[PDB]
Amino acid sequence: CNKQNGVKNILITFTDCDTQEVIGPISHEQPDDTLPTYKNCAWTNTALTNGYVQRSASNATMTLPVVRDLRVPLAFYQGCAQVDVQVEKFDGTVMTLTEGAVVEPEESDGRSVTMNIVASEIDELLPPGSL
Amino acid sequence: CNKQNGVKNILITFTDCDTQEVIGPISHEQPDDTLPTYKNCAWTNTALTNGYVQRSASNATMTLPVVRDLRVPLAFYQGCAQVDVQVEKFDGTVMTLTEGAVVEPEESDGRSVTMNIVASEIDELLPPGSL
Amino acid sequence: CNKQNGVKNILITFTDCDTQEVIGPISHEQPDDTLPTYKNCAWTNTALTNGYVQRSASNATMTLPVVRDLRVPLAFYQGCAQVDVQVEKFDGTVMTLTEGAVVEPEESDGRSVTMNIVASEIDELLPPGSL
Amino acid sequence: CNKQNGVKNILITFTDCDTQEVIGPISHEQPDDTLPTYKNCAWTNTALTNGYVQRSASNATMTLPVVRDLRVPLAFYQGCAQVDVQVEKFDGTVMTLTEGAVVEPEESDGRSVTMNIVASEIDELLPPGSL
Amino acid sequence: CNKQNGVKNILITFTDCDTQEVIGPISHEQPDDTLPTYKNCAWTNTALTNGYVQRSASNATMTLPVVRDLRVPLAFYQGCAQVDVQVEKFDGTVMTLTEGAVVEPEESDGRSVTMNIVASEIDELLPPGSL
Amino acid sequence: GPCYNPDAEYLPASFKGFSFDADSSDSDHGRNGAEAEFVFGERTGYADLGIKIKSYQLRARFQTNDHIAQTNAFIAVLESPGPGLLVHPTRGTVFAACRSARVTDSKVDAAGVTYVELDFVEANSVLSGFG
Fold it and tell me: How far apart are the C-alpha atoms of C77 and C68, rounded to whole Å?
């Protein structure tokens, strides 16, 4: 196939904060057709004048809409646990992220969560053959 | 009958402030298909730099769209009374909250209310089998 | 019946400012299906930290969309006269409000007015039997 | 033929500023079904505390969506001329306004104008029979 | 006819900045049904109190959505050249504007441009017969 | 807390007999001493010299149809000769002397309310002579 824009696998590994118990990597599934979105470059530019740029520092960002697992507390998806995320799309790309931190929690009805995770850097796998 | 996302039971227990009388736990019903939303973590992360996180302090919060009971004064749903809430979904999860405080009241036509409740912590029951 | 969410009666009593002539209580009718909305609790909460609340002071608020009577000047519905309002819904609830003050006027074409009335306290009647 | 909400007659009388020539009262027509809006009170209340009101000073205002006449320069509808307006609805009410001032002009394609007029007071005629 | 609200002719004359070469007046055409919009009055009012007005100074403004000519550089439509515009509607009105200045450029895909032009004064022609 | 009754926990403020409603309550406690910084030395000294004189700052509001008379009476009381007894809303009874009282009172911006910013100082009695 290798011609389908879509997410295939989502692995999340939870680390409890006050017991350091590792949980996972549990698979996960999407609540709707919206895909997780990424941003890898740490430095972010900003226009200055005739052609130049002013460079700022930032984090490697990820937005992950996921369906809560009924075996894991809801608070683990809202900033009360460390997360390691790994998303594999249908065309072969694999984005891994470790020592994340859910940065902006928001009210969730109990099924669908939207995690905003910031890390030092995101790794990309790029299907075989690449420049 | 699992694999149904939806709220099954809502118990709300009112406590007047000027007389310390307890009312309930009365059952309740939703005005529409929107489900209550939760947040159990206490501290909210915030992105800082390349990989690090700045940790702030916050609340356990709950958002409860409910249908006003006709035997209970409307003001009880609008911050003039302490609330103790208990929501049970169809997958078995039970979220209980005690010593609530309706934190941002709003205009209601007299039938449907949306209670924003804040508390120290919300407890999760996590259907049998858990990690 | 007693199973129909809707407004049945709207009585408004106008008091001229510079002559203290009482007018009413004239009945009134809705321009569309939107109902008047209420808020009784005087103190309004605000979240502080782990579980606590900071309490502010406010007014008993009412929002009343109504159809202007052709016998009463338009300025009476826009803050140039004192109002006493009384709304009775179909399920038996009756909200009375006296010594109101139309607080935020807005342009109206001449038929439909939306009065935002603030008072010290709103009284609620709660169909027979109540806790 | 009463019980029709709609505007029947619009007379606008222009007065140039640099020559003090009076033009009109020309009739006019609406560009669409939106009706002009009014506000006759002078002071605008504002909620203060449990029941009280803080009274501010303001204008008698009118909002007039009208179709530009081709014999009158466009600038006359955009603040470069004094206006005296008279609107008669189908229920018999007549709102007259004199010594207007188009207070916030806006881009117009050349046919439809929306005049925001401010004046000391707007007079209401209140179809026969009144209280 | 003389009963059709629409634009008939759009003439634009470009003046290069660093060579003062005059180009035009080239005709032009609309990208969609939105018409150019105008504002002639230089002084703009602002409401003050019971009936009075505070008068500010401004420019004669024009908004011109047009289709880029393939013979003229795109930068000429984005503030890098002086413009003289002349728009003639179907009912006979003619708005001429000279020594304009495209004041707020914005990204354009290469076909449709929206020029925001400010000048000292706009002239209006008013089909024969006028008051 | 969730059932914190404010006006059943804050004392109603009053100075020298005259009662009023306060909007804020501050204090300026402290402990004054010297600070020794011996030259060329990695050591520092401190000497406790006494008690820093206490000062209170309040903000009174007047929102009533006769706020002008109330503010005039309060001015006449505050200018009485000699220190008098003050009921600080959160510190109870003290003996203070008024030191400044700004009276903000606008008309075309907020008519109806009058604010007074008060500044008192702990004024303890003495015993004439050389004590």
Answer: 8
Residue D53, both tokens: 């009101």
Q: Can you name the residues that pair with B13 across neighbouring β-strands? A: B84
Which residue has tokens 């209601």? B108
Partnered with residue C91 across adjacent β-strands are none
What's the gap in Å between the CA of F6 and the closest CA on chain B? 12
Which residues from chain F sit within 8 angstroms of residue D48, using beta carbons?
63, 112-113
Q: What is the resolution of this structure in A?
A: 3.2
Does F39 contact D at CB distance below 8 Å?
Answer: no
Which technique? cryo-EM
Three-state DSSP string of F45-80:
EEEECCCCCCEEEEEEEEECCCHHHHHHHHHHHHCC
Strand partners, D9: D88
CA D27 to chain centre: 14
Furthest-apart CA pair in chain D: how many Å? 56
* Closest by CA position to C104, among listed C69, C77, C71: C77
**CA distances (Å), F97 to each of A130, B27, F71, F124, in order?**
82, 58, 18, 9
Euclidean distance between CA atoms E110 and C84, whole angstroms: 62
Distant-in-sequence, close-in-space partners of A66: CB < 8 Å, separation ≥ 6: A10, A12, A28, A29, A30, A31, A77, A112, A113, A114, A115
Q: What is the DSSP string of B27-60?
A: E---SSSPPPEEE--SEE--B-SSS-B--EE--E
- Alpha-carbon Rg for chain A in angstroms: 16
In this structure, are residues A80 and A97 in contact, taking their beta carbons and an 8 Å threshold?
no
Q: Are B109 and C47 in contact (CB < 8 Å)?
A: no
